[PDB]
Enzyme design. Structure first.
Site, mmCIF file in Angstrom:
data_model
loop_
_atom_site.group_PDB
_atom_site.id
_atom_site.type_symbol
_atom_site.label_atom_id
_atom_site.label_comp_id
_atom_site.label_asym_id
_atom_site.label_seq_id
_atom_site.Cartn_x
_atom_site.Cartn_y
_atom_site.Cartn_z
ATOM 1 N N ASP A 36 44.069 41.773 60.390
ATOM 2 C CA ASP A 36 42.837 41.132 60.824
ATOM 3 C C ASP A 36 43.134 39.733 61.350
ATOM 4 O O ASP A 36 44.142 39.120 61.001
ATOM 5 C CB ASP A 36 41.840 41.046 59.666
ATOM 6 C CG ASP A 36 41.482 42.410 59.092
ATOM 7 O OD1 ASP A 36 42.241 42.937 58.237
ATOM 8 O OD2 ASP A 36 40.407 42.930 59.481
ATOM 9 N N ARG A 82 47.936 52.491 34.612
ATOM 10 C CA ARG A 82 46.807 51.920 35.345
ATOM 11 C C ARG A 82 46.755 52.398 36.800
ATOM 12 O O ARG A 82 46.193 51.721 37.672
ATOM 13 C CB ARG A 82 46.840 50.381 35.264
ATOM 14 C CG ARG A 82 46.648 49.845 33.847
ATOM 15 C CD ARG A 82 46.888 48.322 33.761
ATOM 16 N NE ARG A 82 46.753 47.832 32.390
ATOM 17 C CZ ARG A 82 45.647 47.271 31.911
ATOM 18 N NH1 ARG A 82 44.583 47.125 32.705
ATOM 19 N NH2 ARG A 82 45.604 46.849 30.649
HETATM 20 N N1 LIG Z 1 47.542 39.434 24.955
HETATM 21 C C1 LIG Z 1 46.665 40.352 25.598
HETATM 22 N N2 LIG Z 1 46.553 41.320 24.667
HETATM 23 C C2 LIG Z 1 45.758 42.412 24.911
HETATM 24 N N3 LIG Z 1 45.092 42.523 26.102
HETATM 25 C C3 LIG Z 1 45.214 41.529 27.035
HETATM 26 C C4 LIG Z 1 44.660 41.360 28.301
HETATM 27 C C5 LIG Z 1 43.795 42.260 28.910
HETATM 28 O O1 LIG Z 1 44.503 43.401 29.295
HETATM 29 C C6 LIG Z 1 44.915 43.285 30.684
HETATM 30 C C7 LIG Z 1 46.420 43.196 30.782
HETATM 31 O O2 LIG Z 1 47.063 43.947 29.764
HETATM 32 C C8 LIG Z 1 44.156 42.081 31.250
HETATM 33 O O3 LIG Z 1 43.563 42.366 32.497
HETATM 34 C C9 LIG Z 1 43.149 41.692 30.164
HETATM 35 O O4 LIG Z 1 41.909 42.347 30.381
HETATM 36 N N4 LIG Z 1 45.111 40.195 28.815
HETATM 37 N N5 LIG Z 1 45.930 39.615 27.882
HETATM 38 C C10 LIG Z 1 45.985 40.456 26.795
HETATM 39 N N1 LIG Z 2 41.663 38.283 55.273
HETATM 40 C C1 LIG Z 2 42.642 39.196 54.749
HETATM 41 N N2 LIG Z 2 42.746 40.089 55.765
HETATM 42 C C2 LIG Z 2 43.612 41.147 55.651
HETATM 43 N N3 LIG Z 2 44.374 41.315 54.520
HETATM 44 C C3 LIG Z 2 44.273 40.411 53.490
HETATM 45 C C4 LIG Z 2 44.891 40.331 52.246
HETATM 46 C C5 LIG Z 2 45.844 41.223 51.751
HETATM 47 O O1 LIG Z 2 45.241 42.448 51.438
HETATM 48 C C6 LIG Z 2 45.086 42.579 49.995
HETATM 49 C C7 LIG Z 2 43.656 42.958 49.684
HETATM 50 O O2 LIG Z 2 42.790 42.622 50.759
HETATM 51 C C8 LIG Z 2 45.565 41.243 49.420
HETATM 52 O O3 LIG Z 2 46.148 41.378 48.138
HETATM 53 C C9 LIG Z 2 46.533 40.737 50.480
HETATM 54 O O4 LIG Z 2 47.776 41.419 50.372
HETATM 55 N N4 LIG Z 2 44.404 39.241 51.611
HETATM 56 N N5 LIG Z 2 43.490 38.632 52.431
HETATM 57 C C10 LIG Z 2 43.413 39.367 53.592
#
Ligand SMILES: Nc1ncnc2c([C@@H]3O[C@H](CO)[C@@H](O)[C@H]3O)n[nH]c12
Ligand SMILES: Nc1ncnc2c([C@@H]3O[C@H](CO)[C@@H](O)[C@H]3O)n[nH]c12
Ligand SMILES: Nc1ncnc2c([C@@H]3O[C@H](CO)[C@@H](O)[C@H]3O)n[nH]c12
Ligand SMILES: Nc1ncnc2c([C@@H]3O[C@H](CO)[C@@H](O)[C@H]3O)n[nH]c12
Ligand SMILES: Nc1ncnc2c([C@@H]3O[C@H](CO)[C@@H](O)[C@H]3O)n[nH]c12
Ligand SMILES: Nc1ncnc2c([C@@H]3O[C@H](CO)[C@@H](O)[C@H]3O)n[nH]c12
EC number: 2.4.2.1
Lengths: 233, 233, 233, 233, 233, 233
Positions: E204, E43
């Site tokens: 930020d 991914r």
């Molecule tokens: N038991 C499961 N089996 C197959 N796919 C998924 C998923 C899907 O796949 C992703 C994680 O594998 C998630 O984002 C969802 O879209 N979640 N849980 C799952």
């Molecule tokens: N108001 C905010 N400002 C800056 N960074 C973040 C984040 C951080 O950045 C990532 C995506 O924005 C998130 O997963 C967290 O690690 N969350 N919220 C935020």
């Protein structure tokens, strides 16, 4: 002249008896009231006003469930100037302290409803009756020789429950039976500063399975009906 | 048989129309069915069984509220083997996208009830109709020249809301209107593997305060009724 | 330009297909889109624009989880003016009514997330797709001879569930499979007045433990991809 | 013997008086009981036993808050088989129906604690007193010439509240005053099949900011101490 | 050979540095790791095993949101035998006790997620780091002349929050900044008996509206990244 | 002056030690504090100021349970300008990593109270101590050769738990023992910008049922007491 009651304003006496079944309301009006006028009939939900030992008395059907009950109670208070509300109905016992045909006086109505958390800051609202009416109920029952059973009921959103495994826990906490209106009736009356109390008659026992018969259901309850009429005259 | 339906087994057709008011249910029988037979009348909650264009169909009242509605639908399915449930009714519009006399197809029913959290692990149960029924309604509405509004409705335990300040947010999330039973009907149909759908006519707009005249209410909803019966043909 | 999308307003076509895996998005562009161009790549989260049967189409990866999906869909809508969001993905079957490679159209998305209660006044938001989009899907599948399974999915915050004992109950309630995004997509689209639909194919069956060999995961999802593209063209 | 009580088996009489403050319990023992003796003193929380017009009667401190009360009530019932529990104490009035030196009989104790939901299936436990104890309270008060104010209290986990804006809603729903123990006392005695009642006198008025003198806070409660002693002899 | 990591069991060293953005992860390996090898890329989520100044070490991207972060750290601990997880990232400052580019050590992660209640019996789980790492962090940073800010962060399910009016209150409760992963990370590490710690840089400031420049967001974080890499002895 | 504290402003030092048991507070004054004087005594809840090895120092008892602790802690900060709060006390271990007499530093306090949800927008507030205080504790504890156990604690509203079946789960999540105040003291301190830390000695093991003799009660806790006073100098 609300959406669920078409009685004219004034047509309700300040004391209303409440029961969920409009046909049971018609029975009360036709067997115990003198010169009983049918005053409201929206949705087949019948309401009457009459006299009981020369005292002016109203009856009103409220349907099943907290939401239905809350609709009719609210309108009776806010539009029809009803001050005292006395509800009767069946219930399914869950406690060994009571049995078939016992009459229960709800001094508390627990619930699995979210309604009271909505009313009340998402905290626990202890929905209780007006104590004055509960005192009259006791004294009237002692007078008539009725062994009134006193304790909590549980008002549930479900007739067909998904928590039957919990009935013993409830019973332990002094819940004698389960019905579906009292916690709404008590909240609505608290909100709108009215006087209310609920009485219910065991028709089924959900633990011991004892269940009455179809026509002890039609006669076993005149005892409770008479109690309510007596405590309003 | 069932504590709230005194119909004989097989008195109900597998397709049943639902409405909260047994008098509307009664209206529909007299005006729209041929050879209609009353089949149940417990608690004055009327139910019928007639023919529309030679095809046999049933009607049934279900009261007001999720709790009330859940009782009748449960019994209709588990006991009377009803397979398809078409619930019509009225609603209070909250969205600018609908007006008076509009017919709404609820493809989701949000709720302030706790009933679905209790049914569903204390999580969020997305209460939804059967898709095929909703496909058939949309096809039937085009056949009849009816303009079908599709969206969510919000099923409240309160007719008299304590959260009118929230109506804009609900409409923002594509809730066209508020009523009081759809979420229970949908969850019960989901529970019992049956096909349900809810239609409702805007009788009242809760934001612009427009309301139908009493004359209009009584006969502005025939087209919804015909829609319902046509998709059961 | 947003903190998570590298593109300029205009690069996205108004109709955007969505997938969790950015390498799956690339796979679709390189296989199905003429004039495939890459338009964003913040956090390796790839988005594409291109054409399918003469219709200009966009594609975007949303990651895993409601919170992640909610970020990308909010931005596609609010900054990049996307109007129709067609999400595809995999899912874990929990119902006996579906098997491997089946395509599920999610007409409802339940969830164990708190996000919808945070959006929706602590009540129950029934997260649902656009009904027009889901109609198009059904029609397009019938035209293409794809058997489309329709029901609810459950969108969890947990890939590794602490509540597997509940799978039978979710299945009882017409939850055909579990994934982790549809409830956020639907609710984000509801909040922002956009048209959304989730489709997902069964890669694993959580009940029978059946699964797809890592290669048959490359290709059996093509019919779902074609369905998605055919309804955007 | 328990971790919080080092009284010996049978040292308590079946009827026990409860007060949050041990030093006021010592005041009650000093001033109102003959033959009084100190039976427990763990954590300086004093319990006494003695006689009042010939009748054996025990006193017990229970600290502040639902959690501290619950500890002592549980041990009193389960290790010292106390049968009747009569709590006296002070409260902050939020109602216009009560003023300073008024005595309140709590027919119901609402709460912001989670303890009752932990106890009771996550539902709404309507925490209430034993009715006969409260009827005895009403009867003794009438005989003693004391005007009893009767209604709900709200038992909070916060002495310094974060929701003072909500006090008016609480009064609307017939919550006469605020204290911190009744909800636990009532649920604990419901749990363990004991008889409990809670009385509390208005020492401060949270709405009009009225307060009683440091001398009145020593002497004015004597009417309430006498009511309780009298309903146990 | 988890569903979300294609490294082979072994390629991860016991100490692993986590970032949300895998392109940031590559930036780390490029600028700070000798012998750096890309070990997983499902991914597009990149894991690296290099050596830091002679010391073997691992880097891993976890994505955005508690759910995504939970998938990755569960697989690292449970399959790749990772024992120490120090997460860095960006955050939105909310307290005036911090300014742009401060490095915050989160000794507490509050959240609006439901995941910990699902983990922890619907009670309040206090999500916290291993203490042996939080002290190592204090000591490494004092050695390095880095002025470490210490407090709580709020992990939210929402980058675009619906509750900005609450930032002050969170701030009053020693929540220095907002991000989206800390509470899921600590909880997961707590569940699986692993050592975890979260550092995050004020990119930020959501009160003042100040913000780093495009350039300061590439280079500034080196100090926090150095602090992390040194502490992994 | 306050409703629960007798001292006049000034008697309290800025560093205050806290025990739930006022007889232990008195025991500490008598045994270790030079020039000790009793400054408050409302409700037999004792407080002192003396000098320990040069430095002035104060002690305060806080009853049992979050609500009680919160009352006293709030009043110490808001009226008596206390700035450093060091609570000691006992706990019931639930983790095999700890045995009797072990001294536990709580890096966080989970809870089954609703108090923090009430304080904190119905979200999860991760209740934690001042990291500085916890640093002196670990430094001082290492100087004194006292072996300090570090982990999470579970603060319950129930000394007698209805969820003993959950103990394993809590320990799996690094809850070493159980007490009844830590989460409340940490949130009050968080609320009012004060410095707080909780130590608790294992006096009972709730899994292996091992306990301490009543002589060990009086005597074993002396290491944890000195540790407190050595870090307040
Ligand atoms: N038991 C499961 N089996 C197959 N796919 C998924 C998923 C899907 O796949 C992703 C994680 O594998 C998630 O984002 C969802 O879209 N979640 N849980 C799952
Ligand atoms: N108001 C905010 N400002 C800056 N960074 C973040 C984040 C951080 O950045 C990532 C995506 O924005 C998130 O997963 C967290 O690690 N969350 N919220 C935020
Ligand atoms: N298990 C039960 N058993 C007997 N009666 C009831 C009732 C009462 O009877 C009605 C249900 O038929 C309902 O309105 C309620 O008042 N609810 N639940 C019941
Ligand atoms: N504001 C409203 N306006 C019009 N109809 C309704 C209804 C519907 O009508 C019934 C209440 O009159 C109820 O059962 C519901 O289906 N609920 N709320 C409504
Ligand atoms: N505003 C208030 N005013 C007077 N009394 C109380 C109380 C009662 O007094 C105690 C507080 O000191 C507590 O245990 C409760 O019984 N709580 N809140 C109060
Ligand atoms: N199982 C348990 N075992 C030993 N001590 C405690 C405590 C502590 O001791 C007090 C209860 O007696 C209370 O204040 C708390 O700090 N709570 N629960 C306990």
């Amino acid at each position: 002249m609300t959406p669920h009651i078409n009685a004219k304003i004034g047509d309700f006496y300040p004391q209303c008896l409440l029961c969920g079944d409009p046909l049971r309301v018609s029975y009360i009006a036709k067997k115990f009231l003198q010169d009983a006028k049918e005053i409201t009939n929206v949705r087949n939900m019948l309401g009457f006003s009459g006299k009981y030992k020369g005292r002016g008395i109203s009856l009103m059907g409220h349907g099943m469930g907290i939401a239905s009950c809350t609709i009719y109670v609210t309108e009776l208070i806010k539009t029809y100037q009803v001050k005292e509300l006395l509800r009767i109905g069946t219930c399914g016992a869950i406690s060994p302290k009571v049995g078939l045909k016992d009459i229960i006086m709800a001094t508390g109505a627990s619930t699995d409803s979210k309604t009271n958390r909505v009313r009340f800051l998402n905290h626990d609202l202890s929905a209780t009756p007006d104590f004055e009416l509960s005192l009259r109920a006791y004294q009237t029952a002692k007078r008539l020789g009725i062994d009134l059973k006193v304790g909590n009921v549980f008002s549930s959103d479900f007739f067909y429950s998904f928590e039957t495994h919990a009935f013993d826990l409830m019973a332990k906490y002094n819940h004698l039976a389960i019905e579906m209106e009292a916690a709404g009736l008590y909240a609505t009356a608290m909100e709108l500063n009215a006087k209310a109390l609920c009485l219910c008659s065991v028709s089924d026992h959900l633990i011991t399975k004892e269940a009455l018969s179809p026509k002890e259901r039609v006669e076993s309850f005149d005892n409770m009906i008479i109690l309510a009429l007596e405590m309003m005259s």
